């Protein structure tokens, strides 16, 4: 519907792609005033100025961030930190936040898709996807959230990095 259209419109300019040996292997996001890219994917960002600045890298949270140049600041993402019970949109079908966990239906994310955001009902990004592990007919995700100030990480057992 129209919500899918608006998600498409926001992802058309808020998400960039990384390149490695002629293959697409990850996506980077522009949240608030920070450009974020997960550390487990190696490559060069397909852009003329994003790759030209220093990156603060941490392997504990498996991510790297930088300060967004002011000449493209407007393409923000309107961050949020509330995490109530329920359903949340995604590029590859709706996911559900229940019991402090993110679950998606079985096979919806292929390896190499790491780096998509997870939007809320109002269009605000709440987490960035890192990996997933399947049980039964569902897949529990492994993401990082932005509660208060600390960027905590949650990972279920047997996860695989995409």
């Amino acid at each position: 519907g129209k919500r899918e259209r608006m998600c498409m419109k926001i992802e058309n300019d808020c998400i960039f792609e990384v390149k490695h040996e002629g293959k697409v292997t990850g996506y980077a996001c522009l949240v608030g005033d920070k450009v974020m890219k997960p550390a487990h994917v190696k490559g060069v960002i397909d852009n003329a100025d994003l790759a030209k600045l220093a990156f603060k890298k941490s392997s504990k949270y498996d991510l790297e961030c930088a300060q967004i140049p002011v000449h493209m600041r407007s393409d923000a993402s309107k961050y949020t930190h509330e995490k109530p019970e329920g359903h949340y949109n995604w590029h590859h079908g709706a996911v559900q936040y229940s019991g402090g966990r993110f679950t998606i239906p079985t096979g919806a994310g292929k390896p190499g898709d790491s780096g998509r955001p997870i939007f809320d009902n109002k269009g605000r990004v709440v987490a960035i996807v890192l990996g997933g592990a399947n049980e039964g007919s569902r897949t529990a995700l492994s993401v990082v959230t932005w509660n208060k100030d600390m960027v905590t990480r949650v990972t279920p057992e047997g996860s695989e990095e995409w």
Binding site: V31, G32, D33, K34, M36, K56, S58, Y61, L63, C65, Y79, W146, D149, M150, V151
Partner: protein
Amino acid sequence: VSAVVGMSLLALISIFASCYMLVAARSKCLTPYALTPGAAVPWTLGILCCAP
């Protein structure tokens, strides 16, 4: 001469190792406030350690 050189080298290596490790400790403590979208370090910790 040998004893003085050895003592000086040991003192320098101890000082360098401890200073580098203190710098690493500061960097690791202040690293997760710099990845959060928005937000800012508390002024207390911002004056205790040099915070950008």
